[PDB]
Design an enzyme around this catalytic site. Structure first.
Site, PDB file in Angstrom:
ATOM      1  CE1 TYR A  28      15.226 -58.278 -18.343  1.00  0.00           C
ATOM      2  CE2 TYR A  28      13.086 -57.440 -19.316  1.00  0.00           C
ATOM      3  CZ  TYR A  28      14.370 -57.275 -18.771  1.00  0.00           C
ATOM      4  OH  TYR A  28      15.026 -55.832 -18.873  1.00  0.00           O
ATOM      5  N   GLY A  30      13.643 -66.666 -21.494  1.00  0.00           N
ATOM      6  CA  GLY A  30      14.193 -66.997 -22.662  1.00  0.00           C
ATOM      7  C   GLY A  30      15.564 -66.498 -22.463  1.00  0.00           C
ATOM      8  N   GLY A  32      18.952 -63.818 -23.237  1.00  0.00           N
ATOM      9  CA  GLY A  32      18.983 -62.438 -23.190  1.00  0.00           C
ATOM     10  C   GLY A  32      17.405 -62.034 -22.713  1.00  0.00           C
ATOM     11  CG  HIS A  48      15.473 -66.660 -12.959  1.00  0.00           C
ATOM     12  ND1 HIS A  48      15.793 -67.047 -14.163  1.00  0.00           N
ATOM     13  CD2 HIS A  48      15.647 -67.559 -12.353  1.00  0.00           C
ATOM     14  CE1 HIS A  48      16.444 -68.405 -13.969  1.00  0.00           C
ATOM     15  NE2 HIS A  48      16.331 -68.771 -12.678  1.00  0.00           N
ATOM     16  CG  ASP A  49      17.181 -62.204 -17.219  1.00  0.00           C
ATOM     17  OD1 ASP A  49      17.162 -63.439 -17.671  1.00  0.00           O
ATOM     18  OD2 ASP A  49      16.989 -61.472 -18.317  1.00  0.00           O
ATOM     19  CE1 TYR A  52      19.383 -68.252 -12.177  1.00  0.00           C
ATOM     20  CE2 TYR A  52      20.316 -69.159 -14.206  1.00  0.00           C
ATOM     21  CZ  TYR A  52      19.411 -69.232 -12.962  1.00  0.00           C
ATOM     22  OH  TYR A  52      18.756 -70.593 -12.782  1.00  0.00           O
ATOM     23  CE1 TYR A  73      19.153 -76.205  -8.280  1.00  0.00           C
ATOM     24  CE2 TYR A  73      20.425 -75.027  -9.811  1.00  0.00           C
ATOM     25  CZ  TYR A  73      19.090 -75.457  -9.481  1.00  0.00           C
ATOM     26  OH  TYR A  73      18.206 -75.107 -10.377  1.00  0.00           O
ATOM     27  CG  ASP A  99      17.201 -72.248 -10.989  1.00  0.00           C
ATOM     28  OD1 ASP A  99      17.872 -73.189 -11.204  1.00  0.00           O
ATOM     29  OD2 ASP A  99      17.436 -71.057 -11.519  1.00  0.00           O
TER      30      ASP A  99
END
Length: 123
Positions: A28, A30, A32, A48-49, A52, A73, A99
């Site tokens: 994960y 990077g 996609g 994290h993916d 988002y 931000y 993040d």
């Protein structure tokens, strides 16, 4: 926004140079990323993916139609701890937190060199 995400990780993980170390990792870290996370450190990313994917469902993220991948931000770093400024509004505030949990996630888990640059077939 990424200028700030890589700053987070060097806050927490200082000898780091994250675009370099935590890119191309497991399934994960990077763009996609599929299949099952190879290690915890990759699950970190795995999460994290989703965070988002999350954000952008947000209505605020909507009508600012904002770009997570462009989210600007503001956070501050000191004595190696992170704070996303109160000034962030509903969207980039969310994004700031994505993040933030990821960045700590990482400081928090072992870095198995052998899934660095894994082959998208292992995923």
């Amino acid at each position: 926004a990424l200028w700030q995400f890589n700053g987070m990780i060097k806050c927490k993980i200082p000898s780091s140079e994250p675009l370099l170390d935590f890119n191309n990792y497991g399934c994960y870290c990077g763009l996609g990323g599929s299949g099952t996370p190879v290690d915890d450190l990759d699950r970190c990313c795995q999460t994290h993916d989703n965070c988002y994917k999350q954000a952008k469902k947000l209505d605020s993220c909507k009508v600012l139609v904002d770009n997570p991948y462009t989210n600007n931000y503001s956070y501050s770093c000191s004595n190696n701890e992170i704070t996303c400024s109160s000034e962030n509004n509903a969207c980039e505030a969310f994004i700031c937190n994505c993040d933030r949990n990821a960045a700590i996630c990482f400081s928090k888990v072992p870095y198995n060199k052998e899934h660095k640059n894994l082959d998208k077939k292992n995923c």
